[PDB]
Amino acid sequence: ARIAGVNIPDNKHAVISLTYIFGVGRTTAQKILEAVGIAPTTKVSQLDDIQLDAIRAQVANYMTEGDLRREVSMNIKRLVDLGCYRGIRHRRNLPVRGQNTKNNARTRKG
Amino acid sequence: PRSLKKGPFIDAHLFAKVENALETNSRKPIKTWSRRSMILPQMVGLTLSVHNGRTHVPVIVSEQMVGHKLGEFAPTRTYR
Amino acid sequence: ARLKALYNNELKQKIKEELGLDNVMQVPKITKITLNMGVGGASQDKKLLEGAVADMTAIAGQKPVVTKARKSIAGFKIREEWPIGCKVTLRGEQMYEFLDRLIAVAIPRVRDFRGFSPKAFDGRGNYSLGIKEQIVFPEVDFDKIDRIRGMDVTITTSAATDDEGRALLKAFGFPFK
Amino acid sequence: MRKDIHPDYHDVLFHDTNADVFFLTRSTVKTKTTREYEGSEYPYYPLDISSASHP
RNA sequence: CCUCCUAAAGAGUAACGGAGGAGUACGAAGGUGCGCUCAGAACGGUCGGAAAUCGUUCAUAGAGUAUAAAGGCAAAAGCG
RNA sequence: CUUACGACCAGGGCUACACACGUGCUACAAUGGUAGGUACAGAGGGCAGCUACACAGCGAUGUGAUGCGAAUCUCAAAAAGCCUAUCGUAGUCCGGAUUGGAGUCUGCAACUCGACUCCAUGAAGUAGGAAUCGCUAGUAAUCGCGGAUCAGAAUGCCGCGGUGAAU
């Protein structure tokens, strides 16, 4: 089945497949499936197309993956062009969250 | 960051300086030592001079700065 | 060929009225649609060409043709007369049908697409667009896909000027800029 | 159009459930399930999204 | 042995004079019939750039002619 | 050394990393992960206070209300474990680094620089080079629970008990 512009593998449960979609998580998928008749146990292949359409409408209510990616990029760019200490941190590839970086500083550069 | 019920933290002397500057819309920098004070919508547009530890650096309060503390725009460590 | 039927009846007259052209014959039209898939990897491993031909044939609906490189570059390490790219040419009734299928399905499935830049036109009335991913078209099947490859589409219009070219596309409804 | 050297090409009906729109066009894709259409019976491929519904 | 200059506007013309190649290759790279036109510059376009392939506008050859140079080459002698 | 090498105060710093380094923690998964149920302790702390119970909240926590200076009330629920559903060798329903967003608390103040809460994002890592270390019995490994400094700030340190080997 295709949700939100990308493909989800059909071999496992609906909630687990929704987890794969960017911007979608397991708890959010459970919340989505609770409202509508679809149950988390049922597989995507088993699940009917009309159910999938209602699911797409529920996902559409939530902010989509492209929109989320663009907002994150926009926020980082806003910090950079503001030039705040946080923007300087983003530009210089150093932890902006305040985490201690004396020795294990590896996981910012890549 | 700060409990919403307590409201923003805004130091009294910078508060007084900024209201006495708002009634004039003066452009001369407000030289201040308190970098812990909340930037409010009222002080959008004018210029402060925030202590960075060694000297004061000007900070022209832009629109996209409310929600940040004064010291965020005054780096303290200078690393090349 | 719903678009072919529609263009003669409706779109042509409204294009003429909108541009205030003196003569009906002046009104522009889409002469041809060309699809290009150049890949450097091909002709060295030699496995890329078969899949590229398969996907291009499936999407286009016509048999594509393999171009032969006319120049050799040391940096790209391409010798003379190697099959590095594949292209196809669509016109007329079949072009209008391909364009209808494209407008119908190809662009909407594209992920993270808001619109096409207005500067894409070269200034002579011709239009060029690039598709990031071939999977977007419905003809291809995601299950048995070896790899993802992007595509280039070119639209040729009689009008020599970009304003009339854009109006011709607008009458057809090509997604807003 | 040279004979016999081209792909299989035939009539197809593309429908969007959300937009409730029917489109008729000839495509090489083949569909296991077909919907009856008053003009004639040709195969059915479902569409998740359609251009008209697309913002 | 071949090309250019020396060589003095027909040919020819020397120096231990100034400059470069040859001692091959092709059953197609020959014949015929048909068809085609290059190098570059700019603009647009996924990876893809200075430059790969695709589209457009100029472009008598600024290309190509198996090979050194001279001449010649559009009925192309160039390319299928 | 004595209008300074003495005395006070605001701001910052002790928390900066191209890289090296010793201690540990969490992993790389099926002897498992996640969901439901369901048991079995120990010792320790509590007016510079722990809160039974009601309601608001997905949550940390909030407003009431009550017992207890505690063999009374309370932190407190023990976890590994046992029964079922599922994931089926996949960088995965492994892993939770990192970042964006929202927030609750302590504190006069959380920018440099607090620990937690939910949502999303989901990096390396699929067992480790020469070399190297601890451990002989309720010991190694494994599991959580306490206390001290403490206004708030543990994987550390100081204790505790469950499971429980091989040689």
XYZ file of C-alpha atoms (C1' of nucleotides) in Angstrom:
669
model
C 0.000 0.000 0.000
C 1.048 3.614 -0.593
C 0.687 6.224 2.153
C 1.814 9.864 2.039
C 3.758 9.601 -1.202
C 5.969 6.609 -0.340
C 5.614 2.831 -0.243
C 5.198 0.737 2.894
C 6.161 -2.969 2.827
C 3.134 -5.280 2.988
C 4.596 -8.163 5.014
C 3.939 -6.867 8.554
C 1.255 -5.226 10.672
C -0.303 -1.865 9.844
C 1.168 -0.066 12.862
C 4.652 -1.419 12.173
C 4.398 -0.297 8.540
C 3.204 3.178 9.574
C 6.284 3.351 11.781
C 8.389 3.222 8.608
C 6.707 6.274 7.064
C 8.757 9.356 7.876
C 6.976 11.642 10.308
C 4.945 8.703 11.655
C 5.551 6.766 14.858
C 4.176 3.673 16.538
C 2.188 5.542 19.193
C 0.803 7.937 16.582
C -0.224 4.991 14.397
C -2.013 3.386 17.351
C -3.807 6.682 17.967
C -4.824 6.858 14.297
C -6.114 3.282 14.164
C -8.029 3.606 17.451
C -10.412 6.221 16.042
C -11.323 4.210 12.939
C -12.410 0.603 12.638
C -8.983 -0.620 11.554
C -7.221 -2.610 14.272
C -3.432 -2.664 14.734
C -3.238 -6.465 14.538
C -4.553 -6.680 10.972
C -1.922 -6.655 8.227
C -1.790 -4.098 5.425
C -2.337 -6.760 2.755
C -5.368 -8.071 4.641
C -6.709 -4.546 5.162
C -9.153 -3.256 2.544
C -8.596 -0.254 0.281
C -11.434 1.861 1.706
C -9.930 1.405 5.163
C -6.591 2.533 3.730
C -8.291 5.645 2.311
C -9.770 6.580 5.685
C -6.288 6.019 7.111
C -4.845 8.372 4.503
C -7.363 11.039 5.516
C -6.361 10.622 9.165
C -2.678 10.882 8.203
C -3.480 13.949 6.097
C -4.822 15.592 9.238
C -1.329 15.130 10.697
C 1.576 17.145 9.334
C 3.138 15.363 6.362
C 6.749 14.255 6.008
C 7.777 16.820 3.393
C 6.218 19.630 5.411
C 8.024 18.424 8.544
C 11.378 18.197 6.758
C 10.908 21.692 5.364
C 9.951 23.126 8.758
C 13.030 21.615 10.411
C 15.252 23.023 7.669
C 13.499 26.383 8.022
C 14.055 26.478 11.792
C 17.747 25.638 11.426
C 18.098 28.268 8.691
C 16.277 30.768 10.916
C 18.815 30.177 13.684
C 21.695 30.517 11.216
C 20.498 33.741 9.577
C 19.528 35.151 12.977
C 23.128 34.388 13.901
C 22.360 33.531 17.514
C 24.782 31.442 19.541
C 22.607 28.476 18.549
C 22.905 29.381 14.863
C 26.672 29.651 15.281
C 26.573 26.187 16.846
C 24.576 24.794 13.922
C 26.912 26.342 11.360
C 30.034 25.161 13.212
C 28.643 21.630 13.712
C 28.915 21.660 17.518
C 26.268 20.458 20.048
C 23.629 23.195 20.401
C 21.540 21.364 23.032
C 24.055 21.928 25.847
C 25.143 18.308 26.160
C 28.553 17.832 27.691
C 31.069 17.413 25.032
C 34.478 16.965 26.732
C 35.537 13.564 25.412
C 32.651 11.894 23.566
C 32.095 14.696 21.081
C 31.934 12.316 18.125
C 28.208 12.387 17.388
C 27.902 15.860 15.940
C 30.332 15.913 13.015
C 29.191 12.617 11.481
C 12.949 26.520 30.686
C 10.359 28.315 32.838
C 6.952 27.380 34.206
C 4.303 29.203 32.191
C 2.341 30.028 35.354
C 5.236 32.067 36.759
C 5.295 34.082 33.534
C 8.418 35.572 31.985
C 11.443 36.592 34.031
C 12.262 40.240 33.390
C 14.704 42.084 35.638
C 13.431 45.278 37.217
C 16.199 47.682 36.188
C 16.293 46.606 32.529
C 12.478 46.720 32.649
C 12.594 50.334 33.825
C 15.237 51.298 31.265
C 13.320 49.699 28.393
C 9.979 51.331 29.230
C 11.671 54.704 29.713
C 13.252 54.158 26.285
C 10.007 53.025 24.627
C 8.170 56.264 25.437
C 10.857 58.084 23.412
C 11.672 55.494 20.715
C 15.319 56.460 21.157
C 17.951 54.600 19.147
C 20.957 54.913 21.461
C 21.954 51.515 22.889
C 20.739 50.510 26.341
C 23.952 49.214 27.924
C 23.041 46.331 30.223
C 24.772 43.750 32.391
C 21.793 41.378 32.858
C 21.867 38.776 30.090
C 19.251 36.635 31.895
C 16.284 38.914 31.133
C 13.475 37.796 28.846
C 13.113 39.572 25.503
C 9.493 40.774 25.328
C 7.408 42.005 22.377
C 7.489 45.498 23.895
C 11.237 45.927 23.295
C 11.164 44.857 19.632
C 13.045 47.319 17.441
C 15.419 49.166 19.768
C 19.019 48.275 20.617
C 20.598 47.004 23.823
C 24.274 46.361 24.563
C 24.562 43.048 26.372
C 27.599 42.201 28.465
C 29.391 39.166 26.970
C 31.776 38.765 29.898
C 34.551 41.047 28.600
C 32.746 43.971 26.926
C 29.253 44.952 25.763
C 28.098 43.919 22.298
C 25.097 45.610 20.627
C 21.941 43.588 20.056
C 19.244 45.128 17.842
C 16.075 43.364 18.978
C 14.511 41.888 15.841
C 11.022 40.415 15.517
C 12.233 36.792 15.614
C 13.951 37.240 18.975
C 11.098 37.235 21.496
C 11.164 33.837 23.151
C 14.948 34.033 23.646
C 17.025 35.272 26.560
C 19.266 38.309 26.189
C 22.494 36.341 26.608
C 21.787 34.039 23.666
C 22.897 36.823 21.287
C 26.141 37.607 23.164
C 28.678 34.775 22.871
C 30.951 34.481 25.906
C 33.774 32.215 24.679
C 35.801 33.349 21.654
C 37.244 30.323 19.833
C 38.884 30.707 16.427
C -6.735 11.062 -26.686
C -9.135 13.120 -24.612
C -6.655 16.005 -24.687
C -6.332 15.754 -28.471
C -10.117 15.968 -28.794
C -10.327 18.766 -26.218
C -7.559 20.979 -27.609
C -9.103 21.535 -31.037
C -12.559 22.259 -29.630
C -11.994 24.281 -26.439
C -8.386 25.101 -25.631
C -7.324 26.512 -29.000
C -10.107 29.109 -29.127
C -9.558 30.265 -25.544
C -5.796 30.496 -26.116
C -6.429 32.720 -29.126
C -8.882 34.873 -27.170
C -6.549 35.126 -24.169
C -3.496 36.153 -26.194
C -5.510 38.362 -28.556
C -3.732 36.841 -31.544
C -4.767 38.284 -34.899
C -4.873 34.921 -36.699
C -6.003 31.478 -35.568
C -3.006 29.791 -37.191
C -0.585 31.802 -35.035
C -1.918 29.926 -31.976
C 0.850 27.651 -30.612
C 0.796 23.890 -30.191
C 3.007 21.182 -28.687
C 4.986 19.689 -31.566
C 6.760 16.871 -29.713
C 7.600 15.379 -26.308
C 11.027 13.812 -25.793
C 12.227 11.675 -22.888
C 15.944 11.408 -22.120
C 17.681 9.027 -19.701
C 21.456 9.487 -19.820
C 23.495 7.397 -17.380
C 27.275 7.180 -17.164
C 27.379 3.781 -15.489
C 25.931 2.094 -18.558
C 28.220 0.502 -21.165
C 30.791 -0.534 -18.512
C 28.898 -2.977 -16.290
C 26.390 -3.389 -19.173
C 23.547 -4.397 -16.803
C 22.082 -0.888 -16.521
C 20.923 -0.674 -20.137
C 18.421 -3.530 -20.001
C 16.607 -2.191 -16.946
C 16.702 1.355 -18.297
C 15.197 0.194 -21.600
C 12.565 -1.834 -19.747
C 11.434 1.040 -17.526
C 11.627 3.594 -20.349
C 9.591 1.372 -22.681
C 7.040 0.675 -19.935
C 6.611 4.357 -19.064
C 6.751 5.825 -22.573
C 4.655 3.260 -24.420
C 7.086 3.338 -27.360
C 10.337 1.570 -28.150
C 13.269 3.784 -27.064
C 16.500 4.279 -29.003
C 20.048 3.991 -27.665
C 22.241 6.964 -28.537
C 25.958 6.558 -29.248
C 28.447 8.981 -27.722
C 30.036 11.204 -30.366
C 32.922 12.437 -28.178
C 35.524 10.899 -25.872
C 36.548 12.579 -22.607
C 39.504 11.462 -20.506
C 37.886 12.612 -17.264
C 34.660 10.703 -17.912
C 36.579 7.777 -19.477
C 34.098 7.440 -22.352
C 35.440 6.103 -25.624
C 33.914 6.917 -28.982
C 30.635 5.324 -30.066
C 29.447 3.791 -26.803
C 25.733 3.427 -25.810
C 25.608 5.742 -22.787
C 22.044 7.073 -23.080
C 18.523 6.182 -24.178
C 15.862 8.543 -25.543
C 12.353 8.380 -27.016
C 10.237 10.779 -29.105
C 6.435 11.068 -28.742
C 4.133 13.122 -30.994
C 0.556 13.764 -32.021
C -2.175 11.434 -30.807
C 0.204 9.256 -28.791
C 1.931 12.352 -27.398
C -1.383 13.823 -26.280
C -2.269 10.524 -24.608
C 1.122 10.403 -22.870
C 0.680 14.006 -21.747
C -2.765 13.193 -20.361
C -1.373 10.232 -18.427
C 1.480 12.411 -17.161
C -0.792 15.209 -15.941
C -3.189 12.635 -14.503
C -0.837 10.510 -12.439
C 2.878 11.152 -12.898
C 3.295 14.523 -11.162
C 0.907 14.037 -8.196
C 2.677 10.883 -6.982
C 5.956 12.823 -6.857
C 7.012 13.221 -3.232
C 7.790 16.628 -1.722
C 6.716 18.523 -4.851
C 4.953 21.879 -4.576
C 5.396 23.280 -8.086
C 7.595 23.819 -11.113
C 9.928 26.825 -11.282
C 8.753 29.565 -13.690
C 12.282 30.113 -15.061
C 12.609 26.604 -16.532
C 11.740 27.928 -19.988
C 14.774 28.628 -22.168
C 13.165 31.807 -23.535
C 12.361 30.390 -26.988
C 9.039 28.855 -25.904
C 10.426 25.363 -25.261
C 9.806 23.716 -21.883
C 11.988 21.257 -19.955
C 11.261 19.375 -16.724
C 13.129 16.744 -14.746
C 11.599 13.871 -12.769
C 13.642 12.824 -9.748
C 12.379 9.240 -9.662
C 11.048 6.924 -12.363
C 8.883 5.000 -9.881
C 6.325 7.824 -9.856
C 4.769 6.674 -13.124
C 2.103 3.971 -12.598
C 3.182 1.718 -15.474
C 6.294 0.493 -13.669
C 5.900 -1.943 -10.773
C 7.656 -1.239 -7.483
C 7.897 -4.907 -6.527
C 10.260 -6.035 -9.299
C 12.392 -2.856 -9.509
C 16.172 -3.210 -9.566
C 17.032 0.450 -8.899
C 15.642 3.992 -8.903
C 16.601 6.279 -11.798
C 15.604 9.825 -12.692
C 14.295 11.006 -16.053
C 14.169 14.151 -18.219
C 11.134 15.307 -20.227
C 11.217 18.020 -22.909
C 8.183 19.667 -24.545
C 8.527 21.485 -27.879
C 6.108 24.281 -28.775
C 5.727 26.207 -32.020
C 5.578 29.614 -30.333
C 8.920 31.409 -30.331
C 8.141 33.261 -27.085
C 7.834 32.155 -23.475
C 4.659 34.068 -22.587
C 2.693 32.257 -25.296
C 4.312 28.937 -24.416
C 3.277 29.336 -20.779
C -0.264 30.326 -21.767
C -0.471 27.227 -23.966
C 0.489 25.102 -20.965
C -1.951 27.014 -18.744
C -4.861 26.272 -21.080
C -3.974 22.585 -20.775
C -3.773 22.934 -16.985
C -0.157 21.926 -16.367
C 0.336 22.386 -12.593
C 0.680 26.023 -11.570
C 4.093 27.607 -11.121
C 4.559 3.339 -36.005
C 6.480 0.260 -37.122
C 4.624 -3.002 -36.581
C 5.364 -5.596 -33.842
C 8.359 -3.750 -32.296
C 6.347 -1.793 -29.686
C 5.014 -2.543 -26.187
C 1.525 -3.755 -25.415
C -0.755 -0.718 -25.381
C -4.465 -0.766 -24.546
C -7.379 1.137 -23.015
C -7.325 1.734 -19.249
C -9.703 3.375 -16.758
C -8.119 5.320 -13.888
C -10.402 6.318 -10.999
C -9.817 8.302 -7.822
C -12.060 7.310 -4.931
C -11.429 10.508 -2.962
C -12.163 12.770 -5.943
C -14.716 10.337 -7.450
C -13.288 11.096 -10.907
C -12.982 8.735 -13.887
C -10.251 9.144 -16.521
C -9.999 7.106 -19.726
C -6.609 6.655 -21.376
C -4.616 3.942 -23.117
C -1.724 2.585 -21.059
C 0.511 -0.471 -21.206
C -0.210 -1.356 -17.570
C -2.472 -4.375 -17.044
C -4.879 -4.692 -14.113
C -6.168 -7.903 -12.544
C -9.467 -6.255 -11.532
C -11.645 -4.268 -13.949
C -14.610 -1.962 -13.334
C -17.575 -1.986 -15.687
C -17.952 1.254 -17.659
C -21.011 2.106 -19.721
C -18.949 2.601 -22.876
C -17.080 -0.697 -22.529
C -15.242 -2.957 -20.084
C -11.538 -2.125 -19.571
C -9.219 -2.827 -16.594
C -9.138 -0.976 -13.266
C -6.078 0.454 -11.508
C -6.771 2.419 -8.290
C -5.156 5.806 -7.655
C -4.217 7.002 -4.177
C -4.057 10.650 -5.316
C -5.227 12.580 -8.378
C -4.049 15.803 -9.987
C -7.374 17.589 -9.484
C -7.451 16.759 -5.770
C -3.742 17.567 -5.486
C -3.263 21.073 -4.000
C 60.965 7.641 -50.760
C 56.934 11.709 -49.483
C 55.277 17.166 -47.961
C 56.650 22.651 -47.167
C 60.415 26.681 -47.870
C 64.857 27.913 -49.981
C 63.003 28.164 -55.725
C 63.873 34.506 -58.318
C 54.391 34.022 -60.218
C 55.440 27.612 -66.457
C 58.871 23.013 -65.435
C 63.663 22.195 -63.226
C 67.325 24.010 -59.776
C 72.512 23.188 -54.743
C 74.517 23.451 -49.599
C 77.114 18.814 -43.330
C 70.518 24.815 -45.678
C 65.408 25.613 -42.350
C 61.066 22.247 -40.707
C 58.318 17.199 -40.443
C 57.041 12.078 -42.026
C 57.640 6.827 -44.725
C 59.683 1.016 -45.082
C 52.235 0.665 -43.379
C 46.645 -0.479 -43.022
C 41.794 -2.050 -44.977
C 37.508 -7.962 -47.848
C 36.057 -2.964 -45.682
C 38.454 1.781 -44.467
C 36.829 -0.858 -52.197
C 32.264 -0.684 -55.803
C 27.375 0.780 -56.420
C 22.274 2.806 -54.899
C 20.182 5.740 -51.315
C 20.332 9.027 -47.291
C 22.919 12.685 -43.919
C 26.063 17.190 -42.549
C 30.705 19.070 -38.809
C 33.814 21.961 -34.720
C 32.237 25.323 -31.412
C 29.236 29.325 -28.483
C 24.905 30.391 -25.553
C 20.135 28.976 -23.161
C 17.063 24.857 -20.429
C 17.252 20.131 -18.274
C 18.186 14.053 -12.541
C 22.504 12.263 -10.865
C 25.913 15.415 -14.321
C 30.625 18.952 -13.350
C 34.535 23.346 -17.706
C 33.324 19.357 -20.585
C 29.141 12.707 -21.124
C 23.724 12.249 -23.248
C 18.750 15.169 -24.351
C 16.136 19.910 -26.415
C 16.610 24.908 -28.746
C 19.226 29.208 -31.539
C 23.518 30.749 -34.625
C 27.451 28.225 -37.056
C 30.988 27.477 -45.610
C 33.718 24.103 -42.179
C 36.563 27.941 -37.210
C 35.217 20.122 -37.939
C 36.380 15.569 -40.438
C 39.146 13.382 -44.370
C 43.295 5.618 -41.210
C 48.543 8.552 -41.291
C 53.351 13.822 -41.745
C 52.406 18.404 -44.698
C 50.465 20.906 -49.352
C 46.500 21.214 -52.387
C 41.492 19.798 -52.408
C 36.842 18.365 -50.723
C 29.045 20.267 -50.776
C 27.470 16.343 -56.995
C 31.007 16.691 -50.627
C 36.503 13.256 -51.572
C 33.523 13.900 -44.825
C 29.413 10.626 -42.098
C 25.761 6.388 -42.023
C 53.132 40.906 50.195
C 51.101 44.835 52.866
C 45.800 51.575 48.960
C 48.101 44.800 47.847
C 50.011 38.350 46.701
C 44.807 41.463 51.864
C 38.925 42.586 51.792
C 33.788 42.927 49.056
C 30.389 42.553 44.677
C 28.048 41.777 39.087
C 29.362 39.060 34.769
C 31.578 35.021 32.868
C 35.149 30.245 33.773
C 36.249 25.932 35.932
C 31.154 22.641 31.202
C 36.123 25.174 24.997
C 37.917 19.999 21.160
C 41.624 18.729 14.625
C 43.108 14.530 18.106
C 45.508 10.904 22.440
C 44.261 8.719 26.918
C 42.587 5.283 31.637
C 37.789 4.081 34.291
C 32.765 2.611 33.521
C 27.277 2.662 31.200
C 24.261 1.292 27.273
C 24.444 -2.250 22.551
C 24.985 -4.805 18.492
C 19.492 -8.850 19.534
C 15.415 -14.778 19.294
C 19.089 -17.487 26.079
C 15.452 -11.807 22.747
C 11.879 -6.949 21.832
C 7.057 -5.404 22.583
C 2.109 -6.131 24.594
C -1.278 -8.144 28.402
C -1.672 -10.700 33.287
C 0.980 -13.112 37.716
C 4.248 -13.946 42.010
C 8.884 -14.177 45.631
C 12.861 -10.005 49.401
C 16.553 -7.515 51.782
C 18.247 -3.616 54.157
C 17.663 1.898 54.213
C 15.285 6.831 54.565
C 11.030 10.398 56.157
C 9.552 17.881 59.689
C 16.517 21.038 56.005
C 9.766 15.678 55.352
C 7.730 10.939 52.991
C 2.619 11.138 51.510
C -2.437 6.860 51.896
C -6.933 8.524 48.965
C -10.113 12.072 45.322
C -10.051 14.618 40.948
C -6.901 17.377 35.840
C -3.581 15.408 32.736
C -1.023 10.587 27.461
C 2.789 11.868 30.697
C 6.543 14.266 34.331
C 3.670 16.404 37.803
C -0.917 19.925 39.850
C -4.955 21.217 43.477
C -7.262 19.177 47.689
C -7.070 15.645 51.778
C -5.041 12.181 55.525
C -1.383 9.190 58.720
C 3.185 9.413 60.652
C 8.774 11.840 64.277
C 7.470 5.985 62.635
C 7.965 -2.929 64.000
C 1.815 1.863 63.376
C 1.567 5.944 58.172
C 4.827 6.293 54.044
C 9.079 6.154 49.516
C 6.801 1.103 47.637
C 5.943 -0.749 42.802
C 10.464 -5.043 43.869
C 13.047 -6.599 38.697
C 15.212 -11.175 36.517
C 11.105 -14.941 36.713
C 6.200 -17.924 35.276
C 1.250 -18.180 31.189
C -0.407 -16.421 26.251
C -0.100 -13.095 21.385
C 3.234 -11.573 18.077
C 7.990 -10.032 15.558
C 11.102 -14.610 12.207
C 17.618 -13.419 11.028
C 16.109 -8.386 8.806
C 20.594 -2.463 10.364
C 14.794 -5.391 11.889
C 8.806 -4.182 16.248
C 17.318 -4.433 17.280
C 19.870 0.306 19.223
C 18.382 5.122 21.378
C 22.934 8.879 19.967
C 21.481 13.521 17.797
C 18.338 17.413 16.645
C 13.342 20.296 16.073
C 8.581 21.176 18.963
C 5.920 21.422 23.188
C 5.900 21.321 28.598
C 6.116 20.229 34.440
C 9.251 21.121 38.601
C 13.693 23.139 42.288
C 15.293 27.713 42.626
C 15.261 35.175 42.343
C 17.162 33.468 38.008
C 18.008 27.012 33.939
C 21.469 31.644 27.563
C 26.879 29.750 28.400
C 24.969 25.209 31.777
C 19.781 21.722 35.483
C 17.335 16.444 35.564
C 12.832 14.857 33.986
C 7.770 14.659 30.472
C 5.283 13.637 25.574
C 5.683 13.975 19.941
C 9.026 13.356 15.673
C 13.403 12.529 14.018
C 16.166 6.897 14.464
C 23.820 7.968 14.029
C 27.454 4.338 14.801
C 27.084 -0.434 16.170
C 25.683 -7.182 12.999
C 30.895 -9.111 18.549
C 35.693 -6.223 17.762
C 43.970 -5.530 15.640
C 48.364 -6.339 18.218
C 47.973 -6.642 23.146
C 45.228 -6.603 28.063
C 42.131 -7.373 33.042
C 38.990 -9.695 37.149
C 37.350 -13.973 39.183
C 37.932 -20.591 43.158
C 31.171 -20.489 45.795
C 26.808 -18.273 47.008
C 32.000 -16.487 44.421
C 32.111 -14.606 38.317
C 27.726 -13.008 35.379
C 23.065 -11.049 35.910
C 18.665 -7.979 38.570
C 16.851 -4.165 40.280
C 16.401 -1.299 45.550
C 18.386 2.054 48.970
C 21.268 5.601 51.336
C 25.507 10.045 51.594
C 26.812 14.815 49.853
C 21.854 17.539 47.963
C 17.394 23.834 47.176
C 17.667 20.628 41.967
C 21.569 18.004 39.697
C 24.319 9.670 38.796
C 25.982 5.269 34.699
C 30.046 7.409 40.204
C 30.856 6.118 45.049
C 29.103 3.421 49.841
C 25.549 -0.807 51.089
C 21.760 -4.377 50.158
C 19.350 -8.703 48.767
C 17.194 -12.623 43.708
C 18.823 -15.648 40.455
C 23.042 -18.482 40.536
C 27.622 -21.320 37.129
C 32.143 -23.877 34.770
C 37.125 -24.913 36.092
